[PDB]
Amino acid sequence: RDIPMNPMCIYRSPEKKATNRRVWELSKANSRFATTFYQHLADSKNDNDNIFLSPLSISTAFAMTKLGACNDTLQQLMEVFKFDTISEKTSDQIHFFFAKLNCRLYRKANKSSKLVSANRLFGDKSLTFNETYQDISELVYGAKLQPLDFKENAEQSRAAINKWVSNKTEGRITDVIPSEAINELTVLVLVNTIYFKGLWKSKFSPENTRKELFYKADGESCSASMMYQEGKFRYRRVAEGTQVLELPFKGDDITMVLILPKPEKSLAKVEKELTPEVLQEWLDELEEMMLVVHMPRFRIEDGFSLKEQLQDMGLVDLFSPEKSKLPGIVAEGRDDLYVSDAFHKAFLEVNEAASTAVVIAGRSLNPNRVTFKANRPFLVFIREVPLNTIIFMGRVANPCVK
Amino acid sequence: DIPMNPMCIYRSATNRRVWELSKANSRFATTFYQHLADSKNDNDNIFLSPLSISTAFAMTKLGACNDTLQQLMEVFKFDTISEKTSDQIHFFFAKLNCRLYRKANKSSKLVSANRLFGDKSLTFNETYQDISELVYGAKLQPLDFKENAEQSRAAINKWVSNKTEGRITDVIPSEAINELTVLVLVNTIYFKGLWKSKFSPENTRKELFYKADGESCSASMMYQEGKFRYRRVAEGTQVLELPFKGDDITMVLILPKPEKSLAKVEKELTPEVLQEWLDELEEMMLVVHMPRFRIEDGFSLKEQLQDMGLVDLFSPEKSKLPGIVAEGRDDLYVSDAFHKAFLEVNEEGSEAAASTAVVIAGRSLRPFLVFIREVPLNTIIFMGRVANPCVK
């Protein structure tokens, strides 16, 4: 029930910008940020470059920091991470919706398809956070303030941070924070990622995993480990013949959508054409169908300093020591409390634990079934169906790496 | 050895008889199978029990002579066991059937029954009657073939029935029996085993079996994941073994790589290969999609068996069968011989039934391989080719 209290900061969202539910409105926004945040990163990159990140992590972390911002800083956050798209809702409210979305998204239960949230903001031992910033982050986001001795044992903290992401990401993401990133002037830094585990609902067979070639953006030749399989999946052929396909995970609430353009016909043009609408409209039109599926095995890693993107985008004040309005952290007072940096790392390795061979007796399909050869650059999304929240996003343009 | 097995005895690590025999059976099974395959089309069904057959004719042999008794020891591969005589086979076959149906205690239900339907008015050798009612537990039952043939065929068919817990009915066709009929030997086997690791209903979906060279059809596939003995042999041929609860009875599957003609594999079958496959199998962690289906097959053994070698036996002017009806050879030949089998695979387990019947004097006339095997004895009980899981 509505408990996260707030003072005199609360910004008013404009009265403007399929049931009526907080989590749905929230997810609708989160998706709009994500799709755009991606359209930018993308446009900045090389066409032959893999891209992988968790928008739901970013969008989540910043909305927590925001629990302690005010005046111009607060507006800016809410304006960048689209939370104001939720017509009429006051800023404080946003956190309640978050709680609600967070409740039914993370836990130690059910069909082992895991989701562990690593979102934490480290500040120097010379920072006493507002007693409420505290209670509410812990409650609504399940996080801490975590005082680190940034000035003295500067490197020790840096490490200590990284030595913490690893233990939560079961050792996979480690050096979330890079080299010259932390020094004596690291008042406070924000780290976050999401680790996820899950097994295919219809695993591929290693025995059929061949060695066909991938057709890059410019290079037209690459040897990838292509996985073979035919079975029933939600699929569809959309505008300009773009193929959309969904491969559910055992933990049903989570799936993996991919989008393949006709005869290459540039992932780029298809990348530029996006919107949560073009997207949902796509997702709506998928019906079960029996077909052949090809997919390379792939592992992609990406880490970064959000700063550069988030400012170009509109989130400046949070970073300016001169403009950052951070009342939530009265370590001392106005005392230029701003945000040093905020890090994110994303990891997805894709397989066929692998040895589980596969046998099928007495299946004899239509000689005329649609196929799906992902031997070209494609998009990747990892959605959470009942919640309708885009958790990761990606582009696989080089599935060889050798 | 004590069994006073008599008349017509013909005569042609490294020794254990019962095995030599099981193995002998097996070499017959594959070959008989191969001919059956041939009169049949590669994408049609085939289910049978080359164990019942070996038996029904093993007990017929009892009363055959000269050229008959010979051809039978040869085609049913009896002259492969060594350093023994024609009358000894039944001693072994007797102990095989002894060690076979007594196994697993109260897990796997494997059971057999044999019986003779002889005419009421005739007198049969008292030895025959005993040696049969002894080595193979077959008690003879007096039927009126001359006055009312039909009702006898009925009563006969209905024998097979309570024996096969309801699955085998029309073993004997409507026009098989007649007034001239002397005897009718019969075997029936039954088995109902539970899967050591059952499939669950919740997980079973209805795939589409678009029939090759034809129309659309509706399949019902089960699925489960677990540890099993498997191996992917030469040419892509997958070979999986499914342990039944009665740990010694176990179904074996053989599927060719992504449909590259089964006939090709059927044509290279021998108990050697089939032994090798089973030999080099290895316990894998894997996923299975077995169709839940039911199939019934039936046919006359006559034709194939002739091509195989049993000619004399089905000939009016030469089948040497003196010891049956005691007095003489009369017109003792086999006008025909029939078989009918039944398979039912499902979440819980598998169910097969079979019954062979030989008539003495009367009138004349895709996917994969399945295999129910008895491990210790190495006896292929039932066997077949599945090519239509939907069947409604």
Tab-separated table of C-alpha atoms in Angstrom, chain A residues 34-366:
chain	number	residue	atom	x	y	z
A	34	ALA	CA	15.013	1.504	-23.460
A	35	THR	CA	14.083	1.583	-27.143
A	36	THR	CA	15.416	5.082	-27.490
A	37	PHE	CA	18.457	4.656	-25.263
A	38	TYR	CA	19.224	1.811	-27.587
A	39	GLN	CA	18.553	3.722	-30.778
A	40	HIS	CA	21.310	6.147	-29.606
A	41	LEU	CA	23.998	3.748	-28.432
A	42	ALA	CA	23.301	1.945	-31.720
A	43	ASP	CA	23.624	4.976	-34.037
A	44	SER	CA	26.955	5.727	-32.392
A	45	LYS	CA	28.373	2.295	-33.158
A	46	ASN	CA	29.917	0.289	-35.950
A	47	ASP	CA	27.459	-1.773	-37.897
A	48	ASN	CA	29.609	-4.923	-37.323
A	49	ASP	CA	29.531	-4.407	-33.591
A	50	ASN	CA	27.661	-6.527	-31.047
A	51	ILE	CA	25.626	-4.547	-28.530
A	52	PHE	CA	24.253	-5.822	-25.205
A	53	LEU	CA	22.786	-4.058	-22.174
A	54	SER	CA	19.965	-4.190	-19.583
A	55	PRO	CA	17.745	-1.127	-19.819
A	56	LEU	CA	15.573	-2.319	-16.937
A	57	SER	CA	18.745	-2.101	-14.810
A	58	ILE	CA	19.676	1.456	-15.793
A	59	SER	CA	16.081	2.694	-15.668
A	60	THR	CA	15.790	1.019	-12.234
A	61	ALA	CA	19.029	2.348	-10.683
A	62	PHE	CA	18.491	5.962	-11.670
A	63	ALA	CA	14.960	5.935	-10.387
A	64	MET	CA	16.473	5.071	-6.971
A	65	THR	CA	19.126	7.784	-7.010
A	66	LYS	CA	16.166	10.029	-7.906
A	67	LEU	CA	14.708	9.144	-4.510
A	68	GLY	CA	17.103	11.789	-3.176
A	69	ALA	CA	17.285	14.428	-5.914
A	70	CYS	CA	15.272	17.661	-6.027
A	71	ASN	CA	14.377	20.856	-7.927
A	72	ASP	CA	15.879	20.815	-11.462
A	73	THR	CA	17.724	17.475	-10.989
A	74	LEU	CA	14.497	15.521	-10.307
A	75	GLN	CA	12.651	16.920	-13.267
A	76	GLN	CA	15.569	16.030	-15.513
A	77	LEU	CA	15.655	12.445	-14.340
A	78	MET	CA	11.922	11.944	-14.671
A	79	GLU	CA	12.062	13.587	-18.090
A	80	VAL	CA	14.910	11.434	-19.425
A	81	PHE	CA	13.829	7.991	-18.122
A	82	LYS	CA	10.277	8.702	-19.420
A	83	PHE	CA	8.540	8.262	-16.051
A	84	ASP	CA	6.444	11.350	-16.796
A	85	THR	CA	4.774	9.586	-19.668
A	86	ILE	CA	2.658	8.168	-16.904
A	87	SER	CA	0.020	10.836	-17.086
A	88	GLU	CA	-0.837	12.715	-13.900
A	89	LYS	CA	1.217	10.639	-11.447
A	90	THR	CA	3.410	12.586	-8.966
A	91	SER	CA	7.136	11.727	-8.780
A	92	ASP	CA	6.946	10.092	-5.344
A	93	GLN	CA	4.284	7.653	-6.653
A	94	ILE	CA	6.669	6.271	-9.281
A	95	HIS	CA	8.550	4.351	-6.538
A	96	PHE	CA	5.431	2.592	-5.371
A	97	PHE	CA	4.838	1.329	-8.931
A	98	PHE	CA	8.427	0.211	-8.882
A	99	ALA	CA	7.963	-1.735	-5.756
A	100	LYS	CA	4.949	-3.426	-7.360
A	101	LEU	CA	6.899	-4.303	-10.517
A	102	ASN	CA	9.901	-5.369	-8.410
A	103	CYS	CA	7.778	-7.588	-6.137
A	104	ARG	CA	6.582	-9.835	-8.977
A	105	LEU	CA	9.931	-9.874	-10.809
A	106	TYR	CA	12.654	-11.034	-8.337
A	107	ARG	CA	12.814	-13.936	-5.809
A	108	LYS	CA	14.160	-17.324	-4.708
A	109	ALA	CA	11.344	-19.551	-5.992
A	110	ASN	CA	9.683	-21.250	-8.989
A	111	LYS	CA	11.051	-22.797	-12.234
A	112	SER	CA	14.727	-22.007	-11.921
A	113	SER	CA	15.096	-19.220	-14.437
A	114	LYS	CA	16.947	-16.735	-12.239
A	115	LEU	CA	16.959	-12.943	-11.953
A	116	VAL	CA	19.293	-11.302	-9.458
A	117	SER	CA	19.420	-7.498	-9.211
A	118	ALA	CA	22.795	-5.913	-8.509
A	119	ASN	CA	21.987	-2.191	-8.069
A	120	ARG	CA	24.030	-0.284	-5.499
A	121	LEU	CA	25.299	3.281	-5.007
A	122	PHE	CA	28.556	3.625	-3.084
A	123	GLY	CA	29.463	6.817	-1.287
A	124	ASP	CA	32.413	7.868	0.845
A	125	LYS	CA	32.373	7.228	4.610
A	126	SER	CA	31.901	11.010	4.880
A	127	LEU	CA	28.301	10.711	3.635
A	128	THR	CA	25.331	10.087	5.950
A	129	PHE	CA	22.358	9.552	3.690
A	130	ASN	CA	18.933	10.868	4.627
A	131	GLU	CA	17.399	8.319	7.036
A	132	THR	CA	14.463	7.944	4.607
A	133	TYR	CA	16.505	7.705	1.422
A	134	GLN	CA	17.822	4.725	3.334
A	135	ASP	CA	14.534	3.062	4.387
A	136	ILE	CA	12.934	3.510	1.010
A	137	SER	CA	15.809	2.252	-1.174
A	138	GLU	CA	16.040	-0.844	1.042
A	139	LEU	CA	12.265	-1.339	0.974
A	140	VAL	CA	11.238	-0.364	-2.623
A	141	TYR	CA	14.434	-1.350	-4.364
A	142	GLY	CA	16.070	-3.687	-1.884
A	143	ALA	CA	19.311	-1.703	-1.827
A	144	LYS	CA	21.840	-0.062	0.412
A	145	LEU	CA	23.884	3.115	0.854
A	146	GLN	CA	27.135	1.208	1.480
A	147	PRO	CA	29.815	3.551	2.812
A	148	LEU	CA	33.197	3.009	1.217
A	149	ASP	CA	36.432	4.657	2.261
A	150	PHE	CA	36.953	6.258	-1.164
A	151	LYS	CA	39.574	8.844	-0.179
A	152	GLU	CA	42.016	6.681	1.836
A	153	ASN	CA	41.553	3.080	0.734
A	154	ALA	CA	40.485	4.332	-2.684
A	155	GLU	CA	41.653	1.369	-4.773
A	156	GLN	CA	40.523	-1.021	-2.027
A	157	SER	CA	36.974	0.315	-2.453
A	158	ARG	CA	37.072	0.115	-6.221
A	159	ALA	CA	38.064	-3.543	-5.899
A	160	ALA	CA	35.653	-4.120	-3.054
A	161	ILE	CA	32.902	-2.934	-5.402
A	162	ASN	CA	33.932	-5.332	-8.129
A	163	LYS	CA	34.482	-8.097	-5.566
A	164	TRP	CA	30.804	-7.669	-4.743
A	165	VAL	CA	29.246	-7.735	-8.224
A	166	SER	CA	31.021	-11.045	-8.822
A	167	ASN	CA	29.533	-12.718	-5.779
A	168	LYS	CA	26.060	-11.636	-6.838
A	169	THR	CA	26.548	-12.431	-10.542
A	170	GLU	CA	27.791	-15.910	-9.593
A	171	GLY	CA	31.245	-14.923	-10.742
A	172	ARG	CA	30.348	-13.908	-14.315
A	173	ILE	CA	30.556	-10.059	-14.211
A	174	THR	CA	33.584	-8.954	-12.327
A	175	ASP	CA	35.424	-5.770	-13.228
A	176	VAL	CA	32.251	-3.769	-13.612
A	177	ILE	CA	34.335	-0.811	-12.562
A	178	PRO	CA	37.491	-0.142	-14.661
A	179	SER	CA	40.976	1.245	-13.848
A	180	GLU	CA	41.119	5.067	-13.578
A	181	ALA	CA	37.542	5.320	-12.482
A	182	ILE	CA	37.939	5.665	-8.693
A	183	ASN	CA	40.244	8.073	-6.766
A	184	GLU	CA	40.230	10.356	-3.698
A	185	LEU	CA	37.449	12.466	-5.197
A	186	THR	CA	34.958	9.690	-5.581
A	187	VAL	CA	32.293	11.087	-3.362
A	188	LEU	CA	29.720	8.622	-4.729
A	189	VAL	CA	29.432	6.105	-7.552
A	190	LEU	CA	26.415	4.025	-8.802
A	191	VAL	CA	26.736	0.419	-10.035
A	192	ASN	CA	24.137	-1.933	-11.276
A	193	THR	CA	23.468	-4.937	-13.413
A	194	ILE	CA	21.137	-7.847	-13.667
A	195	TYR	CA	22.214	-11.468	-13.781
A	196	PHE	CA	19.913	-14.068	-15.243
A	197	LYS	CA	19.851	-17.850	-15.517
A	198	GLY	CA	17.462	-19.963	-17.564
A	199	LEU	CA	17.172	-23.132	-19.646
A	200	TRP	CA	15.470	-23.490	-23.052
A	201	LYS	CA	11.892	-24.875	-23.064
A	202	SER	CA	12.926	-26.760	-26.185
A	203	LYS	CA	16.696	-27.237	-26.020
A	204	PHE	CA	18.644	-27.651	-29.255
A	205	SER	CA	20.694	-30.769	-29.875
A	206	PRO	CA	24.483	-30.589	-29.911
A	207	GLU	CA	24.506	-33.401	-32.447
A	208	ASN	CA	22.907	-31.110	-34.974
A	209	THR	CA	25.056	-28.086	-34.091
A	210	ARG	CA	26.884	-27.790	-37.425
A	211	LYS	CA	29.335	-25.130	-38.672
A	212	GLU	CA	27.640	-22.880	-41.237
A	213	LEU	CA	28.803	-19.385	-42.148
A	214	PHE	CA	27.478	-15.998	-40.940
A	215	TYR	CA	26.947	-13.080	-43.409
A	216	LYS	CA	28.271	-9.875	-41.731
A	217	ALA	CA	27.435	-6.190	-42.440
A	218	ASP	CA	30.473	-5.866	-44.640
A	219	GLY	CA	32.754	-8.820	-44.961
A	220	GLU	CA	30.240	-11.466	-46.041
A	221	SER	CA	32.038	-14.445	-44.459
A	222	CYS	CA	32.295	-15.867	-40.955
A	223	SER	CA	32.306	-19.355	-39.472
A	224	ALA	CA	29.739	-19.643	-36.674
A	225	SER	CA	28.488	-22.620	-34.672
A	226	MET	CA	24.890	-22.773	-36.026
A	227	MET	CA	22.325	-24.676	-33.900
A	228	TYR	CA	19.645	-26.872	-35.770
A	229	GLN	CA	16.026	-27.593	-34.575
A	230	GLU	CA	12.394	-27.751	-35.761
A	231	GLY	CA	9.420	-27.544	-33.425
A	232	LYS	CA	6.554	-25.219	-32.423
A	233	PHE	CA	7.304	-21.528	-31.689
A	234	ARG	CA	5.370	-18.243	-31.907
A	235	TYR	CA	6.455	-16.591	-35.206
A	236	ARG	CA	5.487	-14.094	-37.886
A	237	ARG	CA	6.518	-12.336	-41.057
A	238	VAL	CA	6.016	-8.593	-40.771
A	239	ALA	CA	6.636	-5.367	-42.763
A	240	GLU	CA	9.210	-5.577	-45.549
A	241	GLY	CA	9.386	-9.245	-44.678
A	242	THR	CA	11.108	-8.983	-41.339
A	243	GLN	CA	10.908	-12.290	-39.463
A	244	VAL	CA	10.015	-12.103	-35.764
A	245	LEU	CA	10.431	-15.275	-33.575
A	246	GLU	CA	9.941	-16.147	-29.870
A	247	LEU	CA	11.773	-18.964	-28.032
A	248	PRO	CA	10.321	-19.252	-24.479
A	249	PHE	CA	12.463	-20.300	-21.577
A	250	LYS	CA	11.508	-23.069	-19.066
A	251	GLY	CA	10.733	-20.216	-16.708
A	252	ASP	CA	7.799	-19.329	-19.037
A	253	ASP	CA	7.349	-15.802	-17.790
A	254	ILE	CA	10.602	-15.021	-19.650
A	255	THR	CA	11.286	-15.306	-23.385
A	256	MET	CA	13.809	-14.444	-26.096
A	257	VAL	CA	12.579	-12.494	-29.141
A	258	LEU	CA	14.803	-11.985	-32.214
A	259	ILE	CA	14.118	-10.106	-35.405
A	260	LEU	CA	15.638	-11.020	-38.698
A	261	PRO	CA	15.528	-8.728	-41.766
A	262	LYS	CA	14.878	-10.149	-45.264
A	263	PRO	CA	18.131	-11.083	-47.151
A	264	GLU	CA	20.161	-8.919	-44.751
A	265	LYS	CA	18.366	-5.748	-46.008
A	266	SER	CA	20.190	-3.897	-43.269
A	267	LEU	CA	19.670	-4.509	-39.612
A	268	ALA	CA	20.443	-0.759	-39.616
A	269	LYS	CA	17.381	0.354	-41.564
A	270	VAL	CA	15.354	-2.046	-39.414
A	271	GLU	CA	17.123	-0.710	-36.291
A	272	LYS	CA	16.183	2.904	-37.131
A	273	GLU	CA	12.484	2.025	-37.784
A	274	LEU	CA	11.709	0.925	-34.123
A	275	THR	CA	9.255	2.106	-31.413
A	276	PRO	CA	7.500	0.266	-28.573
A	277	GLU	CA	4.446	0.403	-30.824
A	278	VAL	CA	5.978	-1.120	-33.979
A	279	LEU	CA	7.338	-3.581	-31.456
A	280	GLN	CA	4.190	-4.466	-29.464
A	281	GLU	CA	2.196	-4.564	-32.729
A	282	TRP	CA	4.792	-7.129	-33.888
A	283	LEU	CA	4.530	-9.125	-30.586
A	284	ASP	CA	0.757	-9.207	-30.884
A	285	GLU	CA	0.737	-10.731	-34.361
A	286	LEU	CA	2.732	-13.913	-33.503
A	287	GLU	CA	0.840	-17.219	-33.622
A	288	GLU	CA	2.167	-20.735	-32.930
A	289	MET	CA	3.668	-22.323	-36.024
A	290	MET	CA	5.867	-25.328	-36.770
A	291	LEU	CA	9.182	-24.467	-38.476
A	292	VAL	CA	12.947	-24.984	-38.782
A	293	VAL	CA	15.214	-22.871	-36.611
A	294	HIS	CA	18.864	-21.868	-36.971
A	295	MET	CA	20.766	-19.759	-34.471
A	296	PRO	CA	24.451	-19.363	-33.814
A	297	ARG	CA	25.894	-19.995	-30.388
A	298	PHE	CA	27.067	-16.627	-29.089
A	299	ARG	CA	28.518	-14.855	-26.036
A	300	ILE	CA	28.470	-11.045	-25.797
A	301	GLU	CA	29.873	-8.717	-23.187
A	302	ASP	CA	29.491	-4.912	-22.799
A	303	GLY	CA	30.422	-2.508	-19.994
A	304	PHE	CA	30.314	1.288	-19.839
A	305	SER	CA	30.073	4.681	-18.175
A	306	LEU	CA	26.474	5.799	-18.591
A	307	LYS	CA	27.485	9.416	-18.032
A	308	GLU	CA	28.429	10.271	-21.623
A	309	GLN	CA	25.147	8.914	-23.055
A	310	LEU	CA	22.877	10.096	-20.268
A	311	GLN	CA	24.120	13.691	-20.557
A	312	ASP	CA	23.928	14.013	-24.322
A	313	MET	CA	20.438	12.728	-23.670
A	314	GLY	CA	19.526	15.349	-21.054
A	315	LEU	CA	20.622	14.219	-17.572
A	316	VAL	CA	23.276	16.925	-16.773
A	317	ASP	CA	22.612	18.353	-13.354
A	318	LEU	CA	22.974	14.999	-11.660
A	319	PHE	CA	26.577	15.149	-12.792
A	320	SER	CA	27.462	18.817	-12.407
A	321	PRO	CA	29.018	19.455	-8.952
A	322	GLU	CA	27.658	23.024	-9.424
A	323	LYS	CA	24.042	22.102	-10.387
A	324	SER	CA	23.414	18.681	-8.763
A	325	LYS	CA	20.536	19.059	-6.301
A	326	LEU	CA	20.962	16.055	-4.019
A	327	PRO	CA	19.101	16.856	-0.747
A	328	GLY	CA	18.725	13.155	0.029
A	329	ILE	CA	22.451	12.924	0.862
A	330	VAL	CA	23.139	15.629	3.406
A	331	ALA	CA	26.612	14.240	4.112
A	332	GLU	CA	27.269	17.794	5.240
A	333	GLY	CA	25.005	20.069	3.174
A	334	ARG	CA	25.000	21.780	-0.262
A	335	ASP	CA	28.678	20.801	-0.277
A	336	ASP	CA	28.671	20.139	-4.027
A	337	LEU	CA	27.157	16.679	-3.631
A	338	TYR	CA	26.871	15.318	-7.159
A	339	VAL	CA	27.349	11.955	-8.928
A	340	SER	CA	30.894	10.870	-9.698
A	341	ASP	CA	29.900	8.083	-12.135
A	342	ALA	CA	27.481	5.203	-12.703
A	343	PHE	CA	28.529	1.804	-14.169
A	344	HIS	CA	26.715	-1.004	-15.947
A	345	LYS	CA	27.824	-4.394	-17.391
A	346	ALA	CA	25.741	-6.906	-19.390
A	347	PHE	CA	26.397	-10.579	-20.146
A	348	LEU	CA	24.658	-13.182	-22.272
A	349	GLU	CA	26.291	-16.462	-23.390
A	350	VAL	CA	24.015	-18.685	-25.458
A	351	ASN	CA	23.977	-22.462	-25.819
A	352	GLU	CA	22.218	-25.406	-27.283
A	353	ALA	CA	25.441	-27.196	-18.938
A	354	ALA	CA	25.399	-29.016	-22.301
A	355	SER	CA	25.318	-32.773	-23.121
A	356	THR	CA	21.556	-33.340	-23.136
A	357	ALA	CA	21.210	-35.033	-26.565
A	358	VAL	CA	17.782	-35.076	-28.139
A	359	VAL	CA	15.646	-37.922	-29.623
A	360	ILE	CA	12.331	-37.730	-31.444
A	361	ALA	CA	10.129	-40.603	-32.500
A	362	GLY	CA	7.433	-40.498	-35.141
A	363	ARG	CA	7.184	-36.848	-36.203
A	364	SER	CA	6.777	-36.240	-39.911
A	365	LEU	CA	6.244	-32.674	-40.880
A	366	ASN	CA	4.765	-30.745	-43.772
